[PDB]
Design a protein around this ligand. Sequence first.
Ligand code: ATP
Length: 1412
Amino acid sequence: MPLAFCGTENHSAAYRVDQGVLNNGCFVDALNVVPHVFLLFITFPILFIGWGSTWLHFPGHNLRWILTFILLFVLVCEIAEGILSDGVTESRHLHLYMPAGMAFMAAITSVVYYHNIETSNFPKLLIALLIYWTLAFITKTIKFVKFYDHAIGFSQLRFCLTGLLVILYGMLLLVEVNVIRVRRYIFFKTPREVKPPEDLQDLGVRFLQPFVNLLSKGTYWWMNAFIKTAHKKPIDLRAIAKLPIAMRALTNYQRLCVAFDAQARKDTQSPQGARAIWRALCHAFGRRLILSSTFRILADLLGFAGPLCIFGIVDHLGKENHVFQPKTQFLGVYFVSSQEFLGNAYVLAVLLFLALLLQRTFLQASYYVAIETGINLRGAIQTKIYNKIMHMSTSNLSMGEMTAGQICNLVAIDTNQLMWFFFLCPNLWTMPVQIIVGVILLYYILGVSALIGAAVIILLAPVQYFVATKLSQAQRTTLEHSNERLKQTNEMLRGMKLLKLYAWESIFCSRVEVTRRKEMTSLRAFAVYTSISIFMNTAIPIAAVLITFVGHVSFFKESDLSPSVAFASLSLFHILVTPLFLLSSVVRSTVKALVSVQKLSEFLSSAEIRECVQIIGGFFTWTPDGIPTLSNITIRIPRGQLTMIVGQVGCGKSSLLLATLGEMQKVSGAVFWNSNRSRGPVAYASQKPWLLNATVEENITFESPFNKQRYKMVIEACSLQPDIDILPHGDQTQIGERGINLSGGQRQRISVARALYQQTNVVFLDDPFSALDVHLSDHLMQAGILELLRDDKRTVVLVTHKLQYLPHADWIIAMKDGTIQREGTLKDFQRSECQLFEHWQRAKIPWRACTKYLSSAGILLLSLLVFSQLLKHMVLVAIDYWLAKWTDSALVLDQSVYAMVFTLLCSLGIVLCLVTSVTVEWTGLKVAKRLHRSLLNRIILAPMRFFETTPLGSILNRFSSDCNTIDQHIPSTLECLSRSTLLCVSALTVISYVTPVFLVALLPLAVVCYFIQKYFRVASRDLQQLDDTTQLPLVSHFAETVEGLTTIRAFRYEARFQQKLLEYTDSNNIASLFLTAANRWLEVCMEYIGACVVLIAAATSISNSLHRELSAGLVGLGLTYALMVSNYLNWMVRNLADMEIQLGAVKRIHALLKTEAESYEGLLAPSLIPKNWPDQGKIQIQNLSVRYDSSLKPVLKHVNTLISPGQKIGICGRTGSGKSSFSLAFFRMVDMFEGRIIIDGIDIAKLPLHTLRSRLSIILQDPVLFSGTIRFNLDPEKKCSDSTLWEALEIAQLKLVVKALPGGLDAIITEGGENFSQGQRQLFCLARAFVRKTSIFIMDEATASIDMATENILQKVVMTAFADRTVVTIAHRVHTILSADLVMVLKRGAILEFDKPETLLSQKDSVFASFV
Ligand SMILES: Nc1ncnc2c1ncn2[C@@H]1O[C@H](COP(=O)(O)OP(=O)(O)OP(=O)(O)O)[C@@H](O)[C@H]1O
C-alpha cells in the first residue's frame, strides 16, 4: 500500500495513456497543474526581488480583485469536493486535491504579484501574468469539455465547480485584456500614461483610504502603520492628514450646490425647502448611501447564513454519520452529489467560516461608507449654513441675538443630528429585512413556538421605544433643573472673596445643596427609568427562549427537541435581538432628523442682506415694506475728508451709518459710488463693540500684516500699553469674550484701533467716544485720531454727540428728525438755531477608578453588584448548558423535568437581570450623591488665594462637565462594560469547556487581542480629544461670525472668513474621519479574531464529536457562543475606551477634591472673644509681618500700628504696594507670618474664622449683591428684622427703590441685581455694616463711580461714623481719602509714613505728595 502519486487502484491502471491521450482523467489534472506551477516558477524570483511614495491603481481593477476573491472561494469549494472524493476511496487518490491546492496558492501569489506590480507602474511585467491567464483558461476548458465528453452534467458537483472556475478564468482574462486595451503597452507604438492623483501628489495626506487597493479598503491595512506610529509619538493635528479632494468641504459644497441648482431648476418652489432638501440630499448622497445600504443588505443576508450552518452541522452530527459516501462513480472516480457536498460536516464548517469572514467585513464596510457620507454631509451642510450666515440680515429678524444663539445651537445640534441620521440611515433599510428574514427562517427552523418567540421580540421593541421616550422626558427635566444648579455654581464661583468676606459660605452652600438634592431626586427617577430599559433589554431574550421551548414542548407536542433547530433558533434569536433595541433608537433619530431638516429649512429661507459716498433719493428701512427708518438722505462725501456727523439722542445715527454701509433695504433712492458699479471695503466700527475670541493683537491686526509703528500709534492714542500691561500678556491675552473680560472703553478702543489700523480709503466711527467715558483719554484719543487720519489722508466719518470738536474743524453732516438736514459748514448750523448746543502619557486610571468605587459604593453593595453580575452570567451559562443537555437527552429517546428546570432557570435569569439593573443605577446614584457632597464641602473650605490662583473656568469645568459625566455617562458605561467583558469571559470559558483544545488556541489569539487593544486605546484616546478640541473652534467661529456680522459684511471681507470657516470645518471633519476609520479598523481586526475563534472551535468540536463522540449539544452551544464572543469583543473594546474617556473626568474630579486649605480654627477660649468683639473697634496691629506664598516679597514689616476706637483711620497709600495688602490682611485673609495681630484687644490668631468673618464688616471696590430674596440679599445669615432693613436701606441710599420694589424685603435679587445700580451694591454693603452690629468697616476705593455717587458715599460714611465710628479705608483715589483722622502711606512695601493727625499729613513731604 505505498505512496501513489496519482492513484494505486487497479494496479496503476490510471497510469494508462491508451484510449486516447486526453481521455485519461488524471492527465487532465496534470494539465491543470501545469500553469499554476509555471506561474510559481516564473514569479518567485520577482517577488523575492521585490521584498528585498506614489501609488496609481490600474484602470478597471476593483472587478479584478472581486473576481480573484470569488475564484478563491470556488477553489476552496473544489478543495472540499476533492477531499471528500479522495477520502471516500480505499486508496489515497492524490489527483483529487493537489491541483486545487496549487491553484489556490497560485491565485494568492498572483494577487500578491498584482499588488507588487501595482506598486511599481510597469505594466509590461504582467504580460507573463496574462500569458498565465490564457493557459489556465485553455486548460480548464479542456477539463470542462472532457467532463462534457465524459457526460458528467450538472448532477455532479465538480462539473459545476469546473465550469465556474472556467468562467472565472475567462472573466479575469477579459480583465487582463481590458487592462491591455486601456494602457496600451505591449503592442502599441505609443503607450497611454496616467498620472498619480492630486491627493497623492499633495503628500500631506496620510488618510489614503479612497485611493488604495480594494483589500486595504476592506481590511484597512494602511491604518496599521498609522496606529503603530501613534504609540511612539502622539497624534498631533499636523500629523493628521489633509482634507483630500473628494472629501474637501469646498468640493462637497460644490456638489451640494449643483444638487441645489438641479433641484431648484426642476421644482423652483419658493415656500418649499423640505422637498428641496429631500431631492438635493438624495441626488447628492445616494451614490454613496445606496452603496453603503447595498453592502449592509449583503452583510445582513450573509449574517443570516450563519445559523443555517449550525443547523446543518448539528443535524448531520446527530444523524450518526452513517453514509459518508457519494453515490455517483464514473470511471472509478467518485463524484460528490451536491446534497452530499452540502451535507458534509467539515465542508459546512469551512463554508460557515468564509461566510462569517465576508459578512463581518461588509457590515463594517457599510458602517464606514455611512460614516464617510455622514462626514461629507456635515461638511457641505455646515458650509451651506455658513454661506447663508454670510448674507443674513440682522434687523430683518426681530430677535437677532436670540436667533444668533438659536442658529449657533441650530448649527451644532441640527447639523450633528442630520449627520447622525446619515449614520443610521442603512439601519432602516436592513433591520426590517433583518427582522423579516429572521422571522421567516426561524419559523422554517422551529415552528409556531418560534412565532411565539418572534412575538416576544416584536413586543420588546415598543417597550424600548416608550422607555426611551420617557427617558428623554426625564433627561430634559433633569437638565433644565441642573441648569439652575449650574447657575448656582456660577454664582458660587464668581463671589469667592465676597462670600468669604461677608461670611456667607454656609447659607449659599445650603442654597446650592437644596437644588442639588432636588436634582438628585430627579436623577434618581431618571436612573429608575433608565434601569428599566436595561432590565427589559436583558430579559427579553430569556423570556423569548422560555416561551419558545415551553411552546414547542408543552404547547405544541409536534416534534422532538431538534437540537440543530434549537441552537440555530438560539443563534437566530441573538441575530434578531441585536437590531431590535437599535431600531427604536433609529426611529427616534429619524424623528429628530425630520425636525432638524424642518429647522434648517425654515432657517434657509430667511431674509438675505441685499444684491465717493453719495445718496440722493433717500429712503431706507429695515422691515422689507413700510416705514423707511431713515429717509430724505441726500449727502455727498468724496474722498479726502473728515465728516463729523451730529444729531439728537437716537435721531438716526446708526441707521444712517448702516445705510452708508448698504445694510438697509433702501426703497426709494440711489447710491452713487466711486472708489479712488461695485462696492469697496468700507471700514466700520459699530456702536456695540465686538472682539474675536483671540489675542488682543489678533483683534487689533484683524488678519492683516503687522508693523510696529501703526500698532504703537494705536496703542498710544487709545492708551493701550497701560491696558496691555493691565493684562498678564497684553498683545497675547485672549481678549474679548471667551477670554479676558475687558471693559467697554477698552473694547471700544481696541475696536477703534483695528478700525484705524485696517488701512482703508474710508473709516466709519459710529460713536467711538460714546462708551469711553474716560474724558481725558477720550480727548487724547480724539486728538490722536485727528492726527492719524490727517497723516494718513483717508476719508473719515464720526457720528456721535461729542460736541467738543464737531462744530470746529470738520465738514459736518447733521441728521434732524431721522433725516439729513444740512451737510455743509458750521456757519449754517450757526444759522439754523443749532449752535446753542454747539456753544454748550498615561495609560489608564486604575487608582482613581478604584478610589471612586471604594469611596462611592461601600463593600456591602459593591460586593452585591459584582455578585449579581457574576450570578447573572453564571445563570446564563446554566440555562445554556441545561438547554444543551435537554436537547441531547430528548433526541436519544424525564422531558418535563428538563422543561421545568429550563423555565425555572430562565426565571432566575430574568430575576438576576432585574437585580443587576437595579444595582447599577443604585450604585451610580449613591456615587454621584456622595461625590457631589464631597466636592461641595471641599469647595466651601477653600481660601480665596486658591481662587486667585486657579481660575473659575477650570474649577467650573471640572465641576459641571465632570458631574455630568459622573451623572449621565459613567453608570451606562459601567453597565455596558460589566456586561460585555463578563459575557465575553463567560462565552470563552464555555468554548474552552466544550472544546478543551480551544484554550490552547485562545492564548496566542488573546495575546493578539490584548496588543491590538493596547495600540487602539493609545490611538483612540488621542483621536477623541482631537475631535473635541477640533469641534470647539468651529462653533467658536460661528459665534464670532454671528456676533460681528455687520462688521464682516461692512468690510466686504467675507471670503477670508469663508475660507477660515472651510478650514475649520475640514480640520474637524478629518479628525472625525480618523476616529471613525480607527473604530472601524478595530472592529474589523477583532472580528477576524472572532472568526478564527469560530473556525478553531468548530473544527475541534466536529473532530472530537466524530471520533471522541462529544455530547453534541455542547458543540452547537459552542458555536453559538463563538458567535456571541465574536461580538462581545466589539462591545468589550468599545466600552473599555468609553470607560477610559469617562473616568478621565473623575480622576480630575478626585484630584480637585484633593485641594483643601483655609481651616477654621478658634484655638482660644471662644466664650468671650466674639461677644466682646462688637463695637470696640480696637484692633491694635503689633508688628504683624505679612506674606502670601512666603516666597519673595513680604509687604508688612514690623508694623506696630493701632486704630483707635472712634478714630476711623482712613489710611490710603500706594495701591501697588501698601493699599490692598493691609486691607486684605485686616480681615485675617492673608498670611501674617509673624508679629501679633490683635482684634479689639483679643487674639485674632486663634479665632473662629466663621465668627471672625461674621463680626468684622467690610466694603468693596467692585461691590456685588448676592442673588436671592431681598432679605437674603440684605442679610441671609442674620435675618434680624424688617424694620432694621428698612432703616438700613433708607438711611444709606436707595429708599425710593426699596419702598417702591414689588416685593419689599421679600423680592428676588435678579441674579446680582442686574439693573439696580452700582451704588445699590454699596448701599447693601452699608446695610450689612449697619445690621450685623459691626463697628468696623474695612473699605477699599470705588473703581468707577460718579462724583455725586462718591459724595453720597462720603455722606453715608459720615452716617457710618455717626453710627459705627470705626473704619479703615485705603483708596488709590487719594484726593477723597483725606477726610480722616490718621493715615499711613506705605510705598514700595514697607511702613514708610504714618500721620495720626491729618494736618501733619498735609504738612509733611510725602503725605502731601500723596495728597497732590
Ligand atoms: N440692526 C438693527 N436691528 C434692530 N433695529 C434697528 C437696527 N438698525 C436700526 N434699527 C432701528 O432704527 C431705529 C433708530 O435707532 P437709532 O437710529 O437711534 O440709532 P442711534 O441714533 O445711533 O442710537 P444712539 O443715539 O444710541 O447712538 C431704532 O428703532 C432701531 O431699532
